[PDB]
Amino acid sequence: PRAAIADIAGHLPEQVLTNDVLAQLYPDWPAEKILAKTGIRERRIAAPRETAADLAYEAARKLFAQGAVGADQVDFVILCTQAPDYVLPTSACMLQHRLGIPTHAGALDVNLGCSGYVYGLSLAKGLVETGAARCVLLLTADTYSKYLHPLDKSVRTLFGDGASATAVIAEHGELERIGPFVFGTDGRGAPNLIVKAGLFREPKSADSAREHEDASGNVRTDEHLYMNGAEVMAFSLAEVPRAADRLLALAGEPRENIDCFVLHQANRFMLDALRKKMKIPEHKFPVLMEHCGNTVSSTLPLALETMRANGTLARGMRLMLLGFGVGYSWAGCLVNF
Amino acid sequence: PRAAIADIAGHLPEQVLTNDVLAQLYPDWPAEKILAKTGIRERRIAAPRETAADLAYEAARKLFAQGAVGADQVDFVILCTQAPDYVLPTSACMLQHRLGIPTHAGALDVNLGCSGYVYGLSLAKGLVETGAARCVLLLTADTYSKYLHPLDKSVRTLFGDGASATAVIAEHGELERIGPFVFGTDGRGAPNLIVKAGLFREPKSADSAREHEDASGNVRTDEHLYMNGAEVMAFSLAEVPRAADRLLALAGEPRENIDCFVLHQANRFMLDALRKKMKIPEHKFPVLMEHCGNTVSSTLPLALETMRANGTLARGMRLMLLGFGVGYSWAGCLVNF
């Protein structure tokens, strides 16, 4: 059997965080500046008690309603998230039950961020092509909003909450529909995108709750997200084009064969810098996060969904997907959609 | 390529929690009562600031020193844990760096408990047999000690801390060395084995810190582990024998062809009840947790290591591995060791 993407469905929460509201909160960041620096106009934010798993639930329901796959067919669930319901049990286990998926289905959570979708696809392909599953439900969901400090402008302008559901199914054919892959991990990048306090390396303390204002006027605590934007950008520029070139060389694939290079939707500034370095024309390089922002592991599937909606993605297209960020972690794959 | 288990190494922390020490803490539970009910005499406990990832680090170092694989050969890291360093970044990413594994290696964390090793093997096999990786480092690590209430006798008598490292490598041959698999998930079991407060479904509060004593004299809070022993036992008796039968039916093999049935090492009472229901001879049913207790995802690989040390596991033996617990989650596979 060969693994293929059967269908994708996204879900964004109801609350909207607009540039106008952020500009009212931050005098030094007017709406025009935010848009020029990020290309993001709006982000969606989960309700106070609404979790990433709740968003994934809605994404999966939407997927089933689209009619390519149903809950009864699902025999494995992978949830990629960095904001799970509990330390334990696994959030995917509860989703199996909530979605009415049969108890013979496998289920597990994966902790990855902006590289998560491509890694997720590698796992799903593995399960399908070894006969361990015939229909893998790959879910992505994040609520970074829950650990952004209200006065950390550097991250609140960037991140949105959201989820997706992808069905990876067994297909008959003499064509690789997902793959090959390239992978990357560099744990030296851990301090550059991190929530330091709150789990087992550093339990919450008086120290971790203390607010500190940085040289850019951003306020946070060790219990909130810290992002070194300069470092993350340097990492992305260093590793992403290299990864893309590795992947093409590995596959023996002519570069001209790629119809679309779909990258993790970090922001317009990052995406433009990558596009210029990679020498890819705009029509092969989607930038589609204006109204959702950076949704972490969900950026790629949400982009693919947006592409289908705006008529730029069709069956038979040759894609390269590239995810990169927190870890540091990155991965790329080719797709025959 | 075919996926095979190249080598396994375990690691237990130094601090020993004996039945005698527990008997001093719990007057109502003398050492003989603990041993009769659990079959456990000692558990190992991580140092206060020592994390599950720290234990996995030591397991991996031990594995490399055994000489079947080295850090330079590893091209994918999977860490199965329910006590990660941070909410983000992924703990496996830091382990890649700490262990001197190349940056071209993949790395991710999986959240599963007692079923984690078998699910981990399914993922590792998938990666190897689709050519995504040639040497998967599967790590298991838990520190349940960090969320047991000091006065919750039901759990402190059971759980130990520990880690393991398994190398799953590409082999040439006309034989399935790992597989096939059966899987199970039942999220209705979530409330029966759970740390309720502390993450995103229920952030810590005044209510979550409140201590309550149950009808068996056990004290806990919602920030500590809750285990409904009767429910977990009922679940295990209902699903494990059935899973084994399904697996043998899928494989088309009689139960007599299995040399060893290696089950998650929950405790002696549970293992005895399962052995009798499944009608398996004692010599094919290892009970090896007397000195380490229930180490969660590490129970199976630690058992396998113990079997190699006592000479009851050899290459060419046909094994059934069965993992079951928190989620609810379970899985079984056959192995040609």
Side-chain angles (χ1 to χ4, degrees), chain A residues 240-276:
Chain A
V240 176
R242 187 180 181 275
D245 291 354
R246 295 220 297 114
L247 182 57
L248 293 168
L250 165 73
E253 187 90 14
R255 192 178 187 92
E256 71 187 56
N257 285 10
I258 308 300
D259 297 319
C260 312
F261 292 86
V262 191
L263 278 71
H264 157 62
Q265 302 280 297
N267 62 74
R268 195 168 65 189
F269 191 82
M270 184 75 263
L271 290 167
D272 286 348
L274 285 164
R275 197 192 84 253
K276 295 188 213 288

Side-chain angles (χ1 to χ4, degrees), chain A residues 54 90 96 105 111 185 187 201, chain B residues 54 90 96 103 105 111 185 201:
Chain A
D54 294 333
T90 307
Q96 163 275 322
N111 178 330
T185 304
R201 180 61 72 201
Chain B
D54 292 335
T90 306
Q96 163 276 320
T103 59
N111 179 330
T185 302
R201 178 62 71 201

Side-chain angles (χ1 to χ4, degrees), chain A residues 51 54 84-88 90 93 96 103-107 109-111 119 132 183-185 187-188 195-196 200-201, chain B residues 51 54 82 84-88 90 93 96-97 103-105 107 109-111 119 183-187 195-196 200-201:
Chain A
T51 66
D54 294 333
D85 282 1
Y86 312 114
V87 172
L88 62 98
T90 307
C93 296
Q96 163 275 322
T103 61
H104 62 246
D109 290 352
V110 168
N111 178 330
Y119 275 101
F183 302 114
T185 304
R188 299 176 302 169
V195 176
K196 193 178 278 188
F200 303 98
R201 180 61 72 201
Chain B
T51 66
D54 292 335
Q82 293 184 315
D85 283 2
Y86 313 110
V87 296
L88 66 96
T90 306
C93 296
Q96 163 276 320
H97 167 61
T103 59
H104 63 248
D109 292 349
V110 171
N111 179 330
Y119 276 101
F183 304 113
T185 302
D186 189 352
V195 177
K196 191 178 278 191
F200 302 98
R201 178 62 71 201

Side-chain angles (χ1 to χ4, degrees), chain B residues 272-323:
Chain B
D272 278 348
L274 285 164
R275 189 187 63 83
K276 283 201 264 283
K277 181 166 180 180
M278 297 167 74
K279 297 181 193 297
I280 299 163
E282 268 188 299
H283 80 279
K284 297 190 172 185
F285 202 99
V287 183
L288 301 166
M289 82 290 136
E290 189 190 336
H291 293 98
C292 57
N294 184 341
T295 56
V296 196
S297 64
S298 295
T299 58
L300 287 175
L302 284 168
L304 294 173
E305 179 184 50
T306 299
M307 290 169 64
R308 297 183 83 190
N310 70 26
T312 56
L313 178 58
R315 294 289 181 183
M317 293 190 95
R318 191 98 179 102
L319 319 176
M320 182 184 291
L321 311 181
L322 293 154

Side-chain angles (χ1 to χ4, degrees), chain A residues 1-23 25-31 33-36 38-171 173 175-337:
Chain A
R2 284 292 193 180
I5 300 167
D7 199 10
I8 300 166
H11 176 78
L12 305 176
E14 196 189 332
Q15 195 171 67
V16 190
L17 180 59
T18 60
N19 284 358
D20 296 324
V21 165
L22 290 173
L25 194 69
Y26 313 136
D28 59 317
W29 283 77
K33 188 197 171 182
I34 301 171
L35 193 68
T38 70
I40 302 164
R41 194 176 300 277
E42 293 179 351
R43 319 102 192 107
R44 303 294 192 88
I45 307 297
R49 298 185 68 199
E50 182 180 38
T51 66
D54 294 333
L55 302 184
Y57 172 80
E58 297 298 343
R61 286 304 193 205
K62 282 173 182 187
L63 182 72
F64 300 148
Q66 293 175 181
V69 177
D72 66 302
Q73 285 173 289
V74 176
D75 59 7
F76 215 102
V77 182
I78 299 173
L79 174 67
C80 183
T81 186
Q82 292 185 314
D85 282 1
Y86 312 114
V87 172
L88 62 98
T90 307
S91 290
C93 296
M94 288 172 297
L95 289 170
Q96 163 275 322
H97 163 60
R98 291 175 68 183
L99 292 163
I101 290 162
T103 61
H104 62 246
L108 55 85
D109 290 352
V110 168
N111 178 330
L112 278 173
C114 295
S115 66
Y117 190 68
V118 181
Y119 275 101
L121 288 173
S122 79
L123 298 180
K125 175 190 176 72
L127 291 169
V128 167
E129 300 190 359
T130 58
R134 292 194 66 88
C135 182
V136 179
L137 179 65
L138 172 60
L139 305 169
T140 64
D142 283 292
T143 61
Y144 266 39
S145 69
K146 295 196 194 299
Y147 34 73
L148 307 186
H149 194 281
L151 298 168
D152 197 357
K153 321 180 288 283
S154 68
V155 291
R156 284 196 75 192
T157 59
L158 287 177
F159 295 107
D161 298 348
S164 78
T166 300
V168 180
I169 65 160
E171 203 83 283
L175 187 76
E176 197 178 350
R177 298 278 296 281
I178 296 167
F181 287 81
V182 290
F183 302 114
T185 304
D186 187 355
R188 299 176 302 169
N192 295 327
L193 198 33
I194 184 163
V195 176
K196 193 178 278 188
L199 275 196
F200 303 98
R201 180 61 72 201
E202 184 182 333
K204 297 186 182 178
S205 69
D207 287 318
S208 70
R210 192 172 294 110
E211 292 182 336
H212 303 278
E213 184 187 350
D214 70 20
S216 297
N218 298 313
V219 183
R220 74 188 68 84
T221 77
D222 281 343
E223 292 165 19
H224 292 89
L225 182 71
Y226 169 69
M227 179 174 190
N228 188 323
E231 286 300 327
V232 174
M233 183 168 305
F235 150 73
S236 301
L237 280 166
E239 304 298 345
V240 176
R242 187 180 181 275
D245 291 354
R246 295 220 297 114
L247 182 57
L248 293 168
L250 165 73
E253 187 90 14
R255 192 178 187 92
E256 71 187 56
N257 285 10
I258 308 300
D259 297 319
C260 312
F261 292 86
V262 191
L263 278 71
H264 157 62
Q265 302 280 297
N267 62 74
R268 195 168 65 189
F269 191 82
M270 184 75 263
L271 290 167
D272 286 348
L274 285 164
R275 197 192 84 253
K276 295 188 213 288
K277 184 169 179 176
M278 293 166 80
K279 295 177 179 189
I280 300 164
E282 280 185 283
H283 76 273
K284 288 180 181 270
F285 201 101
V287 177
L288 300 167
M289 76 301 109
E290 192 183 340
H291 296 281
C292 55
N294 182 342
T295 55
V296 197
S297 62
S298 294
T299 58
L300 287 173
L302 285 167
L304 296 170
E305 183 186 46
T306 295
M307 283 167 69
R308 294 181 91 179
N310 69 28
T312 54
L313 182 61
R315 291 287 176 186
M317 290 188 99
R318 182 65 159 164
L319 317 176
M320 181 189 294
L321 311 181
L322 290 154
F324 48 95
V326 60
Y328 292 149
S329 177
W330 68 104
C333 67
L334 301 180
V335 181
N336 284 306
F337 187 67

Side-chain angles (χ1 to χ4, degrees), chain B residues 211-232:
Chain B
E211 291 189 342
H212 302 283
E213 186 187 346
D214 70 19
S216 297
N218 301 305
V219 178
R220 71 189 69 85
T221 77
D222 284 339
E223 295 168 13
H224 296 94
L225 178 71
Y226 169 70
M227 181 177 189
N228 188 325
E231 287 297 324
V232 172

